[PDB]
Design a protein around this motif. Structure first.
Motif, PDB file in Angstrom:
ATOM      1  N   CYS A  33     -30.575  26.041  24.987  1.00 33.78           N
ATOM      2  CA  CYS A  33     -31.894  26.405  24.390  1.00 33.78           C
ATOM      3  C   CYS A  33     -32.461  25.033  24.157  1.00 33.78           C
ATOM      4  CB  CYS A  33     -31.972  27.237  23.291  1.00 33.78           C
ATOM      5  SG  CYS A  33     -31.166  28.682  23.482  1.00 33.78           S
ATOM      6  N   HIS A  34     -31.998  23.992  23.528  1.00 33.88           N
ATOM      7  CA  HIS A  34     -32.344  22.598  23.349  1.00 33.88           C
ATOM      8  C   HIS A  34     -31.985  22.075  24.608  1.00 33.88           C
ATOM      9  CE1 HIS A  34     -33.307  24.116  19.123  1.00 33.88           C
ATOM     10  NE2 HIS A  34     -32.267  24.493  19.159  1.00 33.88           N
ATOM     11  N   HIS A  35     -32.506  22.213  25.606  1.00 31.61           N
ATOM     12  CA  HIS A  35     -32.347  21.779  26.945  1.00 31.61           C
ATOM     13  C   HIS A  35     -32.446  20.393  27.211  1.00 31.61           C
ATOM     14  CE1 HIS A  35     -36.359  21.216  28.150  1.00 31.61           C
ATOM     15  NE2 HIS A  35     -36.578  22.508  27.760  1.00 31.61           N
ATOM     16  N   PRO A  36     -32.008  19.610  28.106  1.00 29.86           N
ATOM     17  CA  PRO A  36     -32.099  18.140  28.572  1.00 29.86           C
ATOM     18  C   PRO A  36     -33.510  17.790  28.922  1.00 29.86           C
ATOM     19  CG  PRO A  36     -30.007  18.879  29.007  1.00 29.86           C
ATOM     20  CD  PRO A  36     -30.703  20.091  29.009  1.00 29.86           C
ATOM     21  N   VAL A  37     -33.893  16.802  28.374  1.00 33.30           N
ATOM     22  CA  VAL A  37     -35.311  16.134  28.629  1.00 33.30           C
ATOM     23  C   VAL A  37     -34.931  14.639  28.806  1.00 33.30           C
ATOM     24  CG1 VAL A  37     -37.660  15.405  27.833  1.00 33.30           C
ATOM     25  CG2 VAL A  37     -36.505  17.880  27.408  1.00 33.30           C
ATOM     26  N   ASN A  38     -35.166  14.098  29.849  1.00 36.02           N
ATOM     27  CA  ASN A  38     -35.146  12.546  30.319  1.00 36.02           C
ATOM     28  C   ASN A  38     -33.607  12.234  29.829  1.00 36.02           C
ATOM     29  OD1 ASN A  38     -37.320  11.195  30.870  1.00 36.02           O
ATOM     30  ND2 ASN A  38     -38.152  11.794  28.917  1.00 36.02           N
ATOM     31  N   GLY A  39     -32.751  13.384  30.469  1.00 32.48           N
ATOM     32  CA  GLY A  39     -31.310  13.216  30.547  1.00 32.48           C
ATOM     33  C   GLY A  39     -30.316  13.384  28.964  1.00 32.48           C
ATOM     34  N   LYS A  40     -31.499  13.835  27.919  1.00 33.35           N
ATOM     35  CA  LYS A  40     -30.624  14.177  26.448  1.00 33.35           C
ATOM     36  C   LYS A  40     -31.327  15.433  26.179  1.00 33.35           C
ATOM     37  CE  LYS A  40     -29.513   9.431  25.368  1.00 33.35           C
ATOM     38  NZ  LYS A  40     -29.224   8.578  24.053  1.00 33.35           N
ATOM     39  N   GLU A  41     -30.298  16.426  25.565  1.00 34.40           N
ATOM     40  CA  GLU A  41     -30.626  17.466  25.028  1.00 34.40           C
ATOM     41  C   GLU A  41     -31.634  17.222  23.780  1.00 34.40           C
ATOM     42  OE1 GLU A  41     -26.982  18.975  23.416  1.00 34.40           O
ATOM     43  OE2 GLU A  41     -26.522  20.129  25.385  1.00 34.40           O
ATOM     44  N   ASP A  42     -32.767  17.812  23.909  1.00 38.15           N
ATOM     45  CA  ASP A  42     -33.931  17.724  23.210  1.00 38.15           C
ATOM     46  C   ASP A  42     -33.917  18.814  22.103  1.00 38.15           C
ATOM     47  OD1 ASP A  42     -36.789  17.197  22.014  1.00 38.15           O
ATOM     48  OD2 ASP A  42     -36.886  15.974  23.858  1.00 38.15           O
ATOM     49  N   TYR A  43     -34.128  18.402  20.550  1.00 38.03           N
ATOM     50  CA  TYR A  43     -33.841  19.294  19.608  1.00 38.03           C
ATOM     51  C   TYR A  43     -35.264  19.390  18.962  1.00 38.03           C
ATOM     52  CZ  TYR A  43     -29.040  19.663  20.399  1.00 38.03           C
ATOM     53  OH  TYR A  43     -27.821  20.183  20.700  1.00 38.03           O
ATOM     54  N   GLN A  44     -36.485  18.851  19.436  1.00 39.71           N
ATOM     55  CA  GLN A  44     -37.828  19.084  18.792  1.00 39.71           C
ATOM     56  C   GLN A  44     -38.487  20.379  18.909  1.00 39.71           C
ATOM     57  OE1 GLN A  44     -40.222  15.211  19.922  1.00 39.71           O
ATOM     58  NE2 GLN A  44     -38.972  15.499  21.584  1.00 39.71           N
ATOM     59  N   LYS A  45     -39.134  20.699  18.128  1.00 35.33           N
ATOM     60  CA  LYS A  45     -40.084  21.945  18.170  1.00 35.33           C
ATOM     61  C   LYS A  45     -40.321  22.424  19.553  1.00 35.33           C
ATOM     62  CE  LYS A  45     -41.218  22.521  13.402  1.00 35.33           C
ATOM     63  NZ  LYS A  45     -40.628  21.367  13.062  1.00 35.33           N
ATOM     64  N   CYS A  46     -40.276  23.464  20.240  1.00 39.66           N
ATOM     65  CA  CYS A  46     -40.398  23.929  21.627  1.00 39.66           C
ATOM     66  C   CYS A  46     -42.186  23.502  21.905  1.00 39.66           C
ATOM     67  CB  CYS A  46     -40.338  25.538  22.009  1.00 39.66           C
ATOM     68  SG  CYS A  46     -38.510  25.979  21.388  1.00 39.66           S
ATOM     69  N   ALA A  47     -42.953  23.637  20.831  1.00 38.00           N
ATOM     70  CA  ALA A  47     -44.331  23.344  21.106  1.00 38.00           C
ATOM     71  C   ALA A  47     -44.636  22.267  20.921  1.00 38.00           C
ATOM     72  CB  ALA A  47     -45.052  24.584  20.694  1.00 38.00           C
ATOM     73  N   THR A  48     -43.786  21.107  20.581  1.00 38.48           N
ATOM     74  CA  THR A  48     -44.139  19.785  20.305  1.00 38.48           C
ATOM     75  C   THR A  48     -45.158  18.882  21.429  1.00 38.48           C
ATOM     76  OG1 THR A  48     -42.150  19.230  19.067  1.00 38.48           O
ATOM     77  CG2 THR A  48     -43.354  17.291  19.993  1.00 38.48           C
TER      78      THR A  48
END
Ligand code: HEC
Ligand code: HEC
Ligand code: HEC
Ligand code: HEC
Length: 107
Positions: A33-48
């Protein structure tokens, strides 16, 4: 790798808020769910800002908030997408987990 928040988390960017409970999704890998963004799992709010921040119902790009929660054929399973696989041919579970109304997401 932050900490999973308590249940009752309210996703309320719209007029049909949905409660997300991490406890019921313990069997799912955080990164699914907290999928990779720029190579790293991203834990920010989905609508950031910069993420799924467009509330337009017809936006099917990576900016589409509703698209990320409801559509099939996505790179990462969406809420509904994963629930569809979970429910299978069980009509009762399909209603409970994927129904647009009368479901555990939208009463
Ligand atoms: C989907 C099936 C998820 C799994 C598995 C995990 N999380 Fe999660 N989490 C999910 C959602 C839909 C949300 C709400 C995001 C929002 O836009 O508000 C969250 C939220 C968090 C948060 C807080 C984010 C914030 O407000 O800053 C954290 C820190 C978080 N989640 C952590 C986390 C961890 C460590 C998980 C596994 C151990 C995990 N989550 C799984 C969806 C899903
Ligand atoms: C910005 C930092 C984001 C955050 C936080 C979240 N997502 Fe995301 N998402 C982002 C991008 C740039 C992409 C595409 C990545 C790629 O490799 O192509 C996505 C994509 C999705 C998808 C699939 C979209 C599709 O294939 O049409 C889903 C279903 C999705 N993201 C869901 C999602 C959820 C529920 C988030 C919060 C828990 C979340 N993402 C955070 C950027 C960002
Ligand atoms: C799999 C990859 C999933 C994703 C992505 C999401 N969910 Fe889910 N959820 C999943 C399972 C295996 C189950 C349990 C099945 C059952 O029969 O109980 C669930 C359950 C829920 C529920 C019901 C339980 C509860 O917490 O009230 C809800 C309301 C729910 N899930 C919501 C939800 C949302 C809003 C999601 C995306 C933001 C989402 N889930 C993703 C598996 C998976
Ligand atoms: C959980 C697994 C869901 C199911 C089943 C369905 N939807 Fe949903 N929806 C979900 C989330 C996480 C959200 C966002 C909550 C928030 O307020 O942030 C939504 C939102 C919507 C909306 C927005 C309403 C508005 O203000 O315009 C719509 C229109 C919507 N959902 C429609 C919809 C349909 C057509 C569904 C059945 C196919 C359906 N949802 C199921 C999560 C879940």
């Amino acid at each position: 790798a932050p900490k999973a928040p308590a249940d009752g988390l309210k996703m309320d960017k719209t007029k049909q808020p949905v409660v997300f409970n991490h406890s019921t999704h313990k069997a799912v890998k955080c990164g699914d769910c907290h999928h990779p963004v720029n190579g790293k799992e991203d834990y920010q709010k989905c609508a950031t800002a910069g993420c799924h921040d467009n509330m337009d119902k017809k936006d099917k790009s990576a900016k589409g908030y509703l698209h990320a929660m409801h559509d099939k054929g996505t790179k990462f399973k969406s809420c509904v997408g994963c629930h569809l696989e979970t429910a299978g041919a069980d009509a009762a579970k399909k209603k409970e987990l994927t129904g647009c109304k009368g479901s555990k997401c939208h009463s």
